[PDB]
């Protein structure tokens, strides 16, 4: 119903100004844009726009009734607004929205399989053992029916037989199969799990509901549960507390060696 690109090519969910400008400058072209929900004033939105001379402007968008208001103008949807300033009128004098910048969506391009049965390896061979439900990255498949894989739960690498696995859909999060990752539970259930089953210094990671591409590290202190934001960069890394990491696993190792909260280290993920 609009001339805008699909929403997932420019909508970043809840995002602060600093990260939004980082993503626009990573994009690099004048006319690049994104829309975010204000982190500081939730329920209101921001059109962030890379102008000439590396300047990023930010335009507030107010959600009034079932519509969106910018500069006093009314739009039925964010898509209509983007279509308007891409193809109908200019946003700044002589400048229009040109290049949507997509949020860093996690993608797994490698083939994955899932164990339908447990398996105990033959000792002193290249086989690896696994539990029912283990997920694997397939690196290659041999014509014996065997595959060279990495088990995501254990990180062991070796041979398994295709008769004991099924295919995994491309849609599943790349962290599926990690022992600390829960890709299906709700925020409420993560809190409940850490309170009932988890112990002090237990933790888990799940995707953010409000920011596409983000993850949340849930951590249990003696008194409460704290949530920390992990944010991807456009450069295949992850950011937490302004520190940069090659993987979420690296974040977990870091906070096993350094205190995440004064007087606390990560101990064990809550069992799954």
């Amino acid at each position: 119903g609009s001339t805008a690109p699909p929403t997932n090519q420019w909508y970043h969910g809840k995002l602060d100004r600093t990260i939004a400008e980082e993503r626009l400058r990573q994009a690099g072209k004048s006319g690049s844009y994104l829309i975010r929900e204000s982190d500081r004033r939730p329920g209101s939105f921001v059109l962030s726009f890379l102008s000439q001379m590396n300047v990023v402007n930010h335009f507030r968008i107010i959600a009034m009734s079932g519509d969106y208001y910018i500069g006093g103008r009314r739009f039925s949807s964010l898509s209509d607004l983007i279509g308007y300033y891409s193809h109908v009128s200019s946003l700044l004098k002589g400048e229009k929205l040109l290049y949507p910048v997509a949020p860093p969506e996690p993608v797994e391009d490698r083939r994955r399989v899932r164990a339908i049965l447990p398996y105990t390896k033959v000792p002193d061979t290249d086989e690896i053992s696994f539990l029912k439900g283990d997920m694997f990255i397939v690196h290659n498949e041999l014509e014996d029916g065997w595959m060279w894989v990495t088990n995501l739960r254990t990180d062991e690498q070796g041979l398994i037989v295709e008769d004991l696995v099924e295919e995994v859909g491309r849609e599943e999060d790349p962290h599926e199969g990690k022992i600390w990752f829960h890709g299906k539970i709700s925020k409420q259930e993560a809190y409940n799990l850490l309170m009932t089953v988890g112990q002090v210094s237990s933790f888990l990671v799940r995707p953010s509901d409000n920011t596409p591409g983000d993850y949340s590290l849930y951590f249990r202190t003696n008194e409460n549960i704290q949530r920390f934001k992990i944010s991807p960069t456009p450069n295949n890394q992850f950011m937490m507390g302004g520190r940069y990491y090659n993987s979420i696993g690296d974040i977990i190792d870091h906070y096993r060696k350094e205190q995440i909260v004064e007087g606390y280290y990560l101990k064990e993920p809550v069992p799954m």
């Binding site: 100004r17 600093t18 500081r40 004033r41 921001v46 402007n57 930010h58 335009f59 507030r60 910018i70 500069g71 103008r73 300033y85 009128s89 200019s90 946003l91 700044l92 004098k93 949340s216 704290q226 949530r227 920390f228 934001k229 937490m240 507390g241 302004g242 520190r243 906070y255 350094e258 205190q259 995440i260 909260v261 004064e262």
Partner: peptide
């Protein structure tokens, strides 16, 4: 209800009242 910052967080904050928002042409 808010996200927390870790003990070694290195985020240097900026005040919202200083952030300038603009209006379309």
């Amino acid at each position: 209800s808010d996200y927390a910052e870790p003990m070694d967080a290195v985020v240097k904050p900026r005040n919202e009242e200083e952030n300038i928002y603009s209006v379309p042409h």
